[PDB]
């Protein structure tokens, strides 16, 4: 238990008081006979560390419409926010996850902290649409289906077999 120094409120005598733990604050300082009185934080307030504050800190964090609570207000910590589904964090904003155009495919889905990752579809694969989920898929393989080649494919269109 850490302590703090306190010169008695009006006796004058110079003391060594117990601090209050996280989730509490100094409701009443320590005295001659009595130890520090620590009260629990009121709602919407907190203390994350040992302290001798006479008022808990206020849960002052606000989430915007593109955010949700990653953590709620609690006696031991402030609210915190993260980007909602479909958005990623960039310079304090929640931006929409990008989609990979035709000719390119998703190599990693967007998350709260990262945009869609994309790549040009390598040889033998394709993606025909703008999409934030769809990957590069291998071309239809004519020989393995025992068909003949009708139209060669490309990075943005499937190979056609008769």
């Amino acid at each position: 238990t850490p302590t703090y120094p306190w010169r008695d409120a009006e006796t004058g005598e110079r003391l060594v008081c117990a601090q209050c733990p996280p989730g509490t604050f100094v409701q009443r300082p320590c005295r001659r006979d009595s130890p520090t009185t620590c009260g629990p934080c009121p709602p919407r307030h907190y203390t994350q560390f040992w302290n001798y504050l006479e008022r808990c800190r206020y849960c002052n964090v606000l989430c915007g419409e593109r955010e949700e609570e990653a953590r709620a207000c609690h006696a031991t910590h402030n609210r915190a926010c993260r980007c909602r589904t479909g958005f990623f964090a960039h310079a304090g904003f929640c931006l929409e996850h990008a989609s990979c155009p035709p000719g390119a495919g998703v190599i990693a889905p967007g998350t709260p902290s990262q945009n869609t990752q994309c790549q040009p579809c390598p040889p033998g694969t394709f993606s025909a649409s703008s999409s934030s989920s769809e990957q590069c898929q291998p071309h239809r393989n004519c020989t393995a289906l025992g068909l003949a080649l009708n139209v060669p494919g490309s990075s943005s269109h499937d190979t056609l077999c008769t």
Binding site: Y58, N60, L62, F93
Partner: protein, 139 residues
Amino acid sequence: VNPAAHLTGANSSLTGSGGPLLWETQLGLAFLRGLSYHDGALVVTKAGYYYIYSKVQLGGVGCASTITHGLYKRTPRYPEELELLVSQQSPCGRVWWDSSFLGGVVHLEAGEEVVVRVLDERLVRLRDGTRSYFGAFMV
């Protein structure tokens, strides 16, 4: 005894109605000492000269492009708001941020009020009560 206040951004600050910003008045850093509040307005009870101030934190993605941030007086003696201190800003010239601060001394009678407005309000970005606020003290 010397009138003073500091009101902070709150989850209710942006009403979307075209009226003034609302503010927090008791929790965290907010306070009122010899001034009152009502629906967004600091309400004067002791007549005199006050340094009034506001800050608003603006931000957005790309670019309407011109933002007005001002402090306005309401008096019951006249049926519209009187402009006191105003700024025009075009920060959107692709995430961006910009802060606008205003301060100035104005004469206020008992019963008059001061409010903050921003057009377009949708560009104000609340985070925690420290980036947009509104205050005053008698001078």
